[PDB]
Every structure is written in structure tokens, then in C-alpha cells.
Amino acid sequence: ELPPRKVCIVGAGVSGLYIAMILDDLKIPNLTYDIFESSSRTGGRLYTHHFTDAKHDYYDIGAMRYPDIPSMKRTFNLFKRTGMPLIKYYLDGENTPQLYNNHFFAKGVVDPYMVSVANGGTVPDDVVDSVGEKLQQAFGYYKEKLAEDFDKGFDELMLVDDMTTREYLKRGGPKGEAPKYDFFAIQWMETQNTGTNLFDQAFSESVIASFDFDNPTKPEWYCIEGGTSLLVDAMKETLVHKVQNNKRVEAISIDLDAPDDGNMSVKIGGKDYSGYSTVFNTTALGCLDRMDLRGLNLHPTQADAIRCLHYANSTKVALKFSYPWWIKDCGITCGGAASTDLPLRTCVYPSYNLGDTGEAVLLASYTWSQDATRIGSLVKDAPPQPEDELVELILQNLARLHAEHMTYEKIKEAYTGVYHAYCWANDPNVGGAFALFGPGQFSNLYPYLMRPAAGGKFHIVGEASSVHHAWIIGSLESAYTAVYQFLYKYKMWDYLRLLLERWQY
Amino acid sequence: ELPPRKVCIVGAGVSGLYIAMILDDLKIPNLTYDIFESSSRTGGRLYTHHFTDAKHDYYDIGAMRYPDIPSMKRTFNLFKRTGMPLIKYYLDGENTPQLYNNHFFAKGVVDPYMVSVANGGTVPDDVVDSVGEKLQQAFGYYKEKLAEDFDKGFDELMLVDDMTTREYLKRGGPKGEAPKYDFFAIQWMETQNTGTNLFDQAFSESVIASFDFDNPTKPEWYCIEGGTSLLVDAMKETLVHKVQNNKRVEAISIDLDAPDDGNMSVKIGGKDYSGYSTVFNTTALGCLDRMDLRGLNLHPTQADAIRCLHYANSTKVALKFSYPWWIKDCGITCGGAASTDLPLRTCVYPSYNLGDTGEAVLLASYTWSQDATRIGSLVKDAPPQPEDELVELILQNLARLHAEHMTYEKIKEAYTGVYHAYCWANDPNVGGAFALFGPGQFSNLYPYLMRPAAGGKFHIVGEASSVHHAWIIGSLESAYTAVYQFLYKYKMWDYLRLLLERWQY
Ligand SMILES: Cc1cc2nc3c(=O)[nH]c(=O)nc-3n(C[C@H](O)[C@H](O)[C@H](O)COP(=O)(O)OP(=O)(O)OC[C@H]3O[C@@H](n4cnc5c(N)ncnc54)[C@H](O)[C@@H]3O)c2cc1C
Ligand SMILES: Cc1cc2nc3c(=O)[nH]c(=O)nc-3n(C[C@H](O)[C@H](O)[C@H](O)COP(=O)(O)OP(=O)(O)OC[C@H]3O[C@@H](n4cnc5c(N)ncnc54)[C@H](O)[C@@H]3O)c2cc1C
Ligand SMILES: N[C@@H](Cc1ccc(O)cc1)C(=O)O
Numbered sequence A, B: 001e002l003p004p005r006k007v008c009i010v011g012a013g014v015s016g017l018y019i020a021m022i023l024d025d026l027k028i029p030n031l032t033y034d035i036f037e038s039s040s041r042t043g044g045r046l047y048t049h050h051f052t053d054a055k056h057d058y059y060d061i062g063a064m065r066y067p068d069i070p071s072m073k074r075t076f077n078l079f080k081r082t083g084m085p086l087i088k089y090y091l092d093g094e095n096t097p098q099l100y101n102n103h104f105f106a107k108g109v110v111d112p113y114m115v116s117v118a119n120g121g122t123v124p125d126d127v128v129d130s131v132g133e134k135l136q137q138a139f140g141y142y143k144e145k146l147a148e149d150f151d152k153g154f155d156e157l158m159l160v161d162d163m164t165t166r167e168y169l170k171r172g173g174p175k176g177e178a179p180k181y182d183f184f185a186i187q188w189m190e191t192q193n194t195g196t197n198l199f200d201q202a203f204s205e206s207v208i209a210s211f212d213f214d215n216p217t218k219p220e221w222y223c224i225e226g227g228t229s230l231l232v233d234a235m236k237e238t239l240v241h242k243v244q245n246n247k248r249v250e251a252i253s254i255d256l257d258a259p260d261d262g263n264m265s266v267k268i269g270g271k272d273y274s275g276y277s278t279v280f281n282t283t284a285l286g287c288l289d290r291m292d293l294r295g296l297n298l299h300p301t302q303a304d305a306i307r308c309l310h311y312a313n314s315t316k317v318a319l320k321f322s323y324p325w326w327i328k329d330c331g332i333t334c335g336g337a338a339s340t341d342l343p344l345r346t347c348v349y350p351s352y353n354l355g356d357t358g359e360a361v362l363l364a365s366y367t368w369s370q371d372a373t374r375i376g377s378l379v380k381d382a383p384p385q386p387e388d389e390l391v392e393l394i395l396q397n398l399a400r401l402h403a404e405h406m407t408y409e410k411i412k413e414a415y416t417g418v419y420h421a422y423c424w425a426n427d428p429n430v431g432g433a434f435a436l437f438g439p440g441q442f443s444n445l446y447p448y449l450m451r452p453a454a455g456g457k458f459h460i461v462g463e464a465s466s467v468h469h470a471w472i473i474g475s476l477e478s479a480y481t482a483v484y485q486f487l488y489k490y491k492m493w494d495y496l497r498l499l500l501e502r503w504q505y
């Protein structure tokens, strides 16, 4: 018979909720847990904002779209287990405008944006129209290996992880045997592929990004009708021990001089919570770094990983309109996204309100990196109440982006005066949007992040603690692996076998 | 004989005020200007926060310290022109603690922080105690050329501008003939030299940084007693045309069909302001990118520079204490700064309150880059009203850093309950702290940033538009050069000769 044991789950985002879900399913005798969440809200970076309780009157601030690819099977299994209402998500849609250098994209035209050397810009003529082809040449080998087997493909990709994307493109790969691109070529590739400055982060992250968004299998995409927070609701409801909100862990410790299994503790608001046999930390790493972890005696390079692994910013801005003018006036009738070099960068047309003719939400701006920091600087806790600079910027950018069909006056007139925006680097409980590692970090720092700690009783868990950054799948894989390690540590072979039987696939 | 002319100055930080100062001094017949400032406040990144009107009861949120080196002579000339009360600033002081991996630095100790491979960390033994020497070897040749002649030195440095600092250290310079360092060596150098992740930005910025902070001349440093905002006050006072605050420019244009000198205009709150013969934009580039600039017909690569040139974040946190416990109890009696891998990263002991025995301000945290974003996530426009996570974090970090003489209890007891913090990336009027360029940007994008525009009538001015990022000197040089180009364009030879006579040196 198993002795009584308690574990501690720090954070109630999807990782922490998944750990609890797995433990609840295994039903290990005399095992209990505490889940502590710093926010008044549960769900973390699963976060649907509802303007009203009307059917489609929402947008997803965090996770919103899911590609049905093999590496994400665990995510779709969670969806199935919790009865999520899935509907099609249109990554690409009809008639979505693309605007660069104040020109609209045109199929079959040489340099439609007029940015090549031939037209007075500095993008090389042989690059301006062929970003797709040239990035497929840069990323494709690795994408194919990842599709064959993600783990093996990842291990192969790590052999060039010392390079940034820019460095890879500049030098022609590891041996100089690939094409070499000049600064302006690489700049245009970045502009057409990702957020501002992100080619100066890891080549491996750009490859994995391309694998997820431009997967060789050309997958179907899905979203959750009613918002991703429906998943948080579902996971919360099954909990044998409910989330304790407004509980911010500020320290984690192990008492190595104590003989007991339950010799770990955490500190919350100056008070000790003790008796834990294992602690699963599931917070973003910036939050973890703020804790006093001296009581864990972490390897110094593991500590370095917590402080230094790079996070990217992300900002979303959603506006309500009295009618879906992008559908009715612009012929944008089935989702997709408009891309531009204007400040809003990306305008996402919702896939969940396609048949509505009344009030409708538009995800008017979705940005990463420096673009997100810049939009984020206009996003305030208490929005300007009386002129709102962000609203005016978004309306002006939307007018330019949809100029083939709309005017600023008509868009402003359709705008209801209700909007919401969110900058993830401004969230105290995350401090960024997600991990997006710098050069060398996956191959050098990440293995120390994942190093056993406190004699195998402390786990650093979450999307950053995975090879699938910025996806639910990374959070879930990280959680599963940590539960495996926990069961193994305490030699619970019956329940480890059960874990593999029920939860591996 | 000179026709009436009007110019527009966008922004009233130190660049904008300096343009006006020069124009006011040259007294060109029939020339006037408008200065439009978006904020209700004048001064921009010159910004002293006064807790009360008591003598030393302030800290500088922006610029605060000035090295007396030749390349910054124009800054000290501005100080002299305006009667600034300068006092000594102690960059290095006595008894300032350094805390890494929970160990305190001590001179002569081998691997005091226990991070060497020999002691179970991953920092190579031949690097751990010799970061200074190794970075001087990497930067030194260029620092010396910059000392001989900054312009010539810069031009030589541009020949390796394609590399990040990490890339330079990794590959052994451009030919592999310098020492090559592994990931963990470079990581430790970054940790000991700058903010988290900044070695993944331009090598040239790391060099120029080292040149300014560790100049070969071993300079005296100064600060302005009473706060840097005294300079803003003095510059405002002399203005022939006063700053117009709460005037945010949202568009800039030239009418090329009009034959007049004054064929430029700007838009503010939807209203046109016309008749300008030249427009000087002095805002941070993020603010400029948000404007509608179509009316200027900017070269596409100049537009790219505005969007893409990289900015770094910076955050400051200042606490008031009932007595200067760092002076009285820790023997830190003459300024300097404490450095640590704890979240606060750098604690700066003020140089302006050394003889005070009552209330005193401490610049408890000064951070850059990801460190600043993480502290910044706790800095709110409306500070939490009665528990503040940021305050508690700073108090706990201060206790650890000063554990040789203080306890948390004593520091908390000394804390008055009054503090202020500021994260520059969260300021709508800047959107970052300052330019800190990525690899290749100085050598490729920057020349297009500085390209003549609107037929020589539009100027992009400010610290980013200079080779001295993050210093007043960059702003002043940028302003001076733009005024030169303005006088040249309109062939005002008498006044151009006067500019050279009075303002070159
Ligand atoms: C803008 C954005 C868009 C995204 N898009 C998608 C998408 O389309 N599809 C997809 O699959 N994924 C997407 N992702 C990723 C997905 O949202 C995340 O990977 C996942 O939600 C992360 O879950 P987590 O449990 O690892 O971390 P979190 O969600 O961060 O959960 C950690 C929890 O810990 C809490 N916490 C923090 N500090 C403390 C403390 N001291 N004590 C106690 N608790 C604390 C936090 O409040 C939080 O609730 C997106 C993410 C973002 C930010
Ligand atoms: C944290 C920090 C520490 C620093 N430390 C030092 C130091 O120790 N020593 C040193 O010499 N230098 C230092 N610097 C640098 C120095 O502060 C700056 O380089 C200088 O103040 C920038 O002046 P500027 O005129 O170029 O830009 P800004 O100060 O940004 O002025 C531009 C003005 O334009 C306004 N504006 C923005 N948008 C609009 C619009 N649409 N319409 C109208 N107006 C607009 C802004 O509000 C602002 O007032 C520091 C800077 C920071 C942020
Ligand atoms: N997965 C998130 C964002 C993201 C994806 C991949 C990344 O590498 C980084 C961020 C989305 O759906 O937009």
C-alpha cells in the first residue's frame, strides 16, 4: 500500500491543469495535490476575451488555432477528451489583401511592391519574388526530417543551432555550400516570413516555425467554437482538487536533511506550505526567475537558462464593428489573414463568425517581437476614456489595407467604439508571449533547463520546457514527461505502466 | 532680403530643443518655427522624477551620467551654455557588492562565484576570471581607433558590422584569427558585460558601448545636481517660440506640385498645419513609423530602417529610505553600482546625496533588454494600492545583494513606502529606451535612414539618427547636422558660415 503523498503544481495554465488531469485519471492511492495560481484567473495563455455573452462576440488573446499534424496529436486528443466543439480554421482565405511599400500584391507580376533594385529599392531582383522558394531551400531538408520523426529531426537540427537565421542565410549554411544572401535579401525574407528582427534569433526556431505553419502535409486547421477558454473550463471542472487562485509562489525549497518523501515546500505571501514529495513549476521562466530558489540548489547553468532563455513579445488588438464589412464589402468571406508592413502587421479575419450579418469582431492586429512592443506601448490597463491613439492607428491602417474596397470614414462609421487589446510582455504573470530561443540556446542552455533537480523532485514544466515553443503541444508534452519522471522517481511501476498505457498515445 | 520661412520641429526632447536653440542663436531674418510635442511633458528621455521638492529627493528616469571624453564635448558645451550645476558622478565606488550564483565577489579569488567547469559550472576555467581581459582583446583595436578619430574609427568598425558580438567571439573575428569561444564562455562574458541577450545584437554596438563606459582615457564622470530636467528647463526658457504640448503629429507631407519654399505640412488631430519649408522629425523611430508618411515618398529602404532598426528596453526602479543604509551600514560611501544576476541586475548608489543623513533615494534597479522587460511587466501606470509585487521583489533582492551587512527586515523597516518605477518600452511617446542596432543595421540600413528626403527638406533626427546611440551626444550631433543641411539647402551661406563659426566646436 502506498504511503500518503502530496505534490505541488505551481500555476494553473494548460500544463498545470494537464498534470492534474493525468493524476486524476491515474487515481494513485493516497496521492493528493495543491494547485496554486497567482492570477485571479485560471488558464494562463489560454485566454478568451468575451465582449458580451453573445455567441461569437469574442476573440482569443492567447492560443486560437491548431494544425492537425502528427506532432500535435496529444493536443487533439485533449480536445477529444474534453468534448471541445472544433470548427474549421482558415489559415488562408479568399481575397485577403497584402500591402507592402503601399502597393498591393498581384499574382504573376514581377516585383508588385516595387522594392527591388530594378524598381529603385534594394531587395535583390532574384530574391524579391522568390522568398518562398528560397526559404524552402533553407528550411526544407530539416522540415522533411522533422516530418519523418520530430525528435530525430530535432537532434539533427541541433547540429546547426549555433547559427541565427540571418547567419545561416548570410554564410550559406554550416559549410558555405548553400546560397549566400546579402543583408537586404535577408531583410526582405524576414519581412515576408516573420516578425521584425526575428531572423536574429535561432535558425532552429525559424525552421520549427516553418514546420508548424507551412507543414509538408498541408494540414487542416481548427479552432474552438466559443473560444479556447472553453478548454480551461472543461479541465477545471474535472479537477479532484480545485485551483487555488491569488496564490503567488515566491520561493521553492527542499530540506535535504529530512528523511521523508515530503520534504519540499513553497512560500506564498510569506507563509510556508510544506510536505510536498515533488514540485512541478509550470510558470513562464521570467516568473520562475523571480522566485527565491536557493533552497533547491540548482545547477548554475540551469539557473542561467531560467534567466537567459529568450522570450518574444506578442500583442493582439480586436475591434467590434456593427457589421462584418470585410465579408460584405471586401469579399473576404472565409477567414485568412492580411499581411502588411504597416504597424498593425497582420489582420486576422475570424473563422467563427462567417455567417453573421450583425455585430462582428475583427482581430485587427496581431504582432510579434518589436512590432508587438510598439503596438503594446499603446495598450493601457485603463484605456483612454474621453482620443485613443491605438484605435485611431488601427482604423487608419485598416483603411489603407482595405483601400481597394473601403474608406477610413466607412470603417470608422462601422466601428462600434468597443475594442480590447492585450500585450503579453506586460502581463505580470507571464512577462512575454512565449519562448523563442536565441542562437545556441536550444543546444547549450535547454539541456540544463531540463536537468534533474532537487534529487529528481523538482520539474521545470511548460511550453518553454519543450521543443514545441508557443504551442499547446509543447505544454502538454512537457507535463506528460514530468509526470513520467515523478512516477519513476518513486518507483510506482503499476502506475507508470498505466501512464504509458493510457497517456503515451 | 530673406523671404519669410517657417520650419516644423516634431518633438521637444533634447534634439528638438537643440535645433530651436541653434536657430534662436543664429537669428536668421524672417525665419520662424513651430515645435509640436505629443506629451503634456517637455524633455522626452530627459526626465527627472521628483518625489518631493526637497534638495536631493529625485532620480533620473532617463539620462543621468556624462563621461568627460572628447567625443562628448558638444554635450558638455551645452551644459556650459545653459549653466548646468555639474557635480562628480562616481561610476565606480568603494565597497559595492557583486553577487552571482549567490556568491560575493572578492579580489584575488579564483572563480569566486563557483561557475567554472572545475567547480561544477560550465564556464571554461581560462575565461571565468578573465572576462575583462578577453573583451578588451575583442574590442580594443576598435576602441583605440575610435579614440584616435571617432568617424574614421567607426568607418573601420563598419567592415565587421555584419557580425553580432556572439558571432565575433564564436568565430574568432572576420578571418578566424582571433580567439574562438564556446557558447558558455560567451554567455559568461555577456552576463558580466551587459544586459541579458545583448551579445546577439551588433558587435559594433558592444564596441561603442565599451568605448563609452570603459574609455581608454579613464575619464571623469559628471551628473547634474538637481536632476537632468534642469537642462530641459533651461533650454525651454530661451525659446523664441514656445513648445506646443499635447500636439501629436500623425502625418507629414510635401506638395511637390507647389512651387513655394513652404510646401510641407503636418497633420495633428486630423487638422492640417501647412507652410513649412523644412520638417525636422525628432521622435523615436517607432513613433515615426506610426505616422502616415506617404506624402513624403520615402525611399523603401529608408522606410525599412524606420520600421526595423532595433531598440532596446530599459527600466528603472527607485525607492525612498528613511536613512541611507547603504552609506551608513554597508560602507558604500561614494556612489558606484552593485551588479548581480538577481532580477534587479544593477543597483546604482546616487552620487548626489552622499552627505545626507535623513531621507535618501536609491536607484535600486536599473535594467536593459529582457531583464528590463521582465521588471517592466511589474511596473504599472496606476501602482497597486494597498500588495505590490515589484516592491517586495526589490526589497528581497536588495537584502540578498547587501547580505554582508543588512537583513531584509532592516531594509524593509528603512523603506518609507514611497517608490517610483518606469519602463521606457511602455511609454507611448518613445516605445523603447534607445536604439541598439542588430547585426548589419549600422552598415546597411542606417545610411538609408540618413538619406536626403523630400528633395532635401525632411530630416530624421535624434539619437537613433547618429553613431552615438543612447547618449545626449547622439541627439545633439544629429540635430546639428540637420540644421547644417537645412541652411545648405536654402543656400543661406552667411548663416551656414555662422553655424560653423559658433556651433561646430
Ligand atoms: C499570443 C499567443 C498566441 C498563441 N497562439 C497559439 C495557437 O494558436 N495555438 C496553440 O496551440 N498555442 C498557441 N500559443 C501557446 C499556448 O497559448 C501556450 O503555449 C500555453 O497556453 C502555455 O501554457 P503553460 O501552462 O505552459 O504556461 P501558462 O499558460 O503561462 O501557465 C502558467 C501559469 O502560471 C501562473 N503563474 C505565474 N507565476 C506564478 C507564481 N509565482 N505562482 C503561481 N502561479 C504563477 C500564470 O498566471 C499562469 O496561469 C499562443 C500563445 C500566445 C501567448
Ligand atoms: C533609461 C535611459 C538612460 C539614459 N542614460 C543616459 C545617460 O546617462 N547619459 C546620456 O548622455 N544619455 C542617456 N540616455 C540617452 C538620452 O536620454 C537620449 O539619447 C536623449 O534624451 C534622446 O533625445 P531625442 O530628442 O533624440 O529623443 P526624445 O527624448 O525621445 O525626444 C523626442 C520627443 O518627441 C516626442 N514625440 C513622440 N512622438 C511624437 C509625435 N507623433 N508628435 C510630436 N512629438 C512626438 C516625444 O514625446 C519626445 O518628447 C538615456 C536614455 C534612456 C532612455
Ligand atoms: N503558435 C502561435 C505563435 C507562434 C508560433 C510559432 C513560433 O515559433 C512562435 C510563435 C500562433 O498560432 O500564432
Ligand SMILES: N[C@@H](Cc1ccc(O)cc1)C(=O)O
Pocket (backbone or CB within 6 Å): B064, B065, B205, B208, B209, B212, B434, B436, B469, B470, B471
Ligand atoms: N547611455 C545610457 C545607456 C546606454 C549606453 C550605451 C549603449 O550602447 C546603450 C545604452 C547609460 O548611461 O546608462
